[PDB]
Design a protein around this ligand. Structure first.
Ligand SMILES: C=CC(=O)O[C@H](CC)C(=O)NCCc1c[nH]c2ccccc12
Lengths: 304, 305
């Protein structure tokens, strides 16, 4: 029993964290084989922040203006490329603690663990979702830049996010490990707008199934609903559209509880109409959208 | 910026997790130097668990009825003692990945990270607190027994909890690593239930400070109070008393926001009576008591391990 926002064991990633310094600027880098990936804004001074020309800033740097530091050891830089918004420093030593890994670009709604770090030193680990507006609600102070997000699946670490910057709202923006930003953001200190955020409908439905599996049926009712009629009520609450794809995905969790997806859509409709009236579901006084169908299947037993 | 239930990096502990099997029973063990610590109920079958005599059950076992497994490698058991409710298997090989560590008994209200494991394999990590009723709200399925709780302080892992068993109300009971149970529970298949739980007053105050630091100020008011007046309101809502010591502990967070503790106690007083009137604090409808003052200070400073 029990349900808890559970991050992956941070061990395989801690072994890849390094410190990258460029003049006075210092943030975190990921060290995999002989390469160190980090946000390219390491090469910006306080003046360059507003309208930086990265190619011009970078053609002015040699390898020896990049101090990579793996704990106590200094690492020797022997090459520097730039891919999109990440700097790729080549180093003389391949990371002995390189895990089995791939790079993946996740979609909005999907969850990852974050390993928050300061000076190539890990401080904490927590679970996040890519919001529909492409931001993440993270915990990140100054120096946390280049902290990475990841899933682990069978000893294979899937790096999906690198932290670049905080927005005036207090939410967080970053790139995939190929340096392509998530959302319409750029590594510039120009005012950029955090798009209007929605609740991830499919993740709430999964988390209701999770409550049924942990022995709570109190929120259910005898109604059904057409996919369309739900979405028309859903969107009135700033809930993301539910697609036929979201429905197919929830099939396994519907089957294991014998509550068809659109019955569960009705339970939610009513939950939105009413609130909780002093009850809680899985320990929460509002509806949690940061648990995916996959997440629920893993954490929750086959026994209902 | 931002605030998150944040656990310690699990890597130093991941290196210590192993699989302990005794006949058909299998749960998780902690491997530090040449010793493997695990719940002693590994030596019990489902029949024995009704009223087990552990000293008699254990005098029946030789070292060769204990299969310790560090990933693929088999560890050879060369000695077995007991200590309270933990079994201590001695092994032929000292764990090369043994971190700097102590064993410590935490108080109710204080927090630790848990590394959930199934078959000596770590699956996930989360933060929880020792509740006042000595239970913990964890996520544990069958085979998660011997999963450990810990804090990290600089390089030093402080192991504080070992998972033994789940209770009727779906909360969790366990020992410190010296095998002394937290709360009035026994390692036995019997009728045991969690006492009436209280909300950890000092941790809620800390988490309100955390909200003020992250911009949420709507709950503040110009009104103050005295410890005693508040404690009468606390006790009414199944909230733990607030002591002069809890107040001194909140000193740093009061100073950094210039909201004296009893000002903040007034905000809470009112929050308890009059509701949150729709609004949320740090994206929560309820008042969160599973963040300590230390926890708050650390996350809003950024100190590393
Ligand atoms: C690593 C800092 C972090 O994650 O958080 C801080 C405070 C929350 C922050 O505000 N980040 C902005 C860093 C940044 C954005 N664009 C830039 C262009 C040049 C140099 C720096 C930047």
């Amino acid at each position: 029993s029990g349900f808890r926002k559970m991050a992956f064991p941070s061990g395989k990633v801690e072994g890849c964290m390094v410190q990258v310094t460029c003049g006075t600027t210092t943030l975190n880098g990921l060290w995999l084989d002989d390469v160190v990936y980090c946000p390219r804004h390491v090469i910006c001074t306080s003046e360059d922040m507003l309208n930086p020309n990265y190619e011009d800033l970078l053609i002015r740097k040699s390898n020896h203006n990049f101090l990579v530091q793996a704990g106590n050891v200094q690492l020797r830089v022997i090459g520097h490329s730039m891919q999109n918004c990440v700097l790729k420093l080549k180093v003389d030593t391949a990371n002995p603690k390189t895990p089995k890994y791939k790079f993946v670009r996740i979609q909005p709604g999907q969850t990852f663990s974050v390993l928050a770090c300061y000076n190539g030193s890990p401080s904490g680990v927590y679970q996040c979702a890519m919001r529909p507006n492409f931001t993440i609600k993270g915990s990140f102070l100054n120096g946390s830049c280049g902290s990475v997000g990841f899933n682990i699946d069978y000893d294979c670490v899937s790096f999906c996010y690198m932290h670049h910057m905080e927005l005036p709202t207090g939410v967080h923006a970053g790139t995939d490990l190929e340096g392509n930003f998530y959302g319409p953001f750029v590594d510039r200190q120009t005012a950029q707008a955090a798009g209007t955020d929605t609740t991830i409908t499919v993740n709430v439905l999964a988390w209701l199934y999770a409550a049924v599996i942990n022995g709570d049926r109190w929120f259910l009712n005898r109604f059904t609903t057409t996919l369309n009629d739900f979405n028309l009520v859903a969107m009135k609450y700033n809930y993301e559209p539910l697609t036929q794809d979201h429905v197919d995905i929830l099939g396994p969790l519907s089957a294991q509880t014998g509550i068809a997806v659109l019955d569960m859509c009705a339970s939610l409709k009513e939950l939105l109409q009413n609130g909780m009236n002093g009850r809680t579901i899985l320990g929460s006084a509002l509806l949690e959208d940061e648990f995916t169908p996959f997440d629920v299947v893993r954490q929750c037993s086959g026994v209902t």
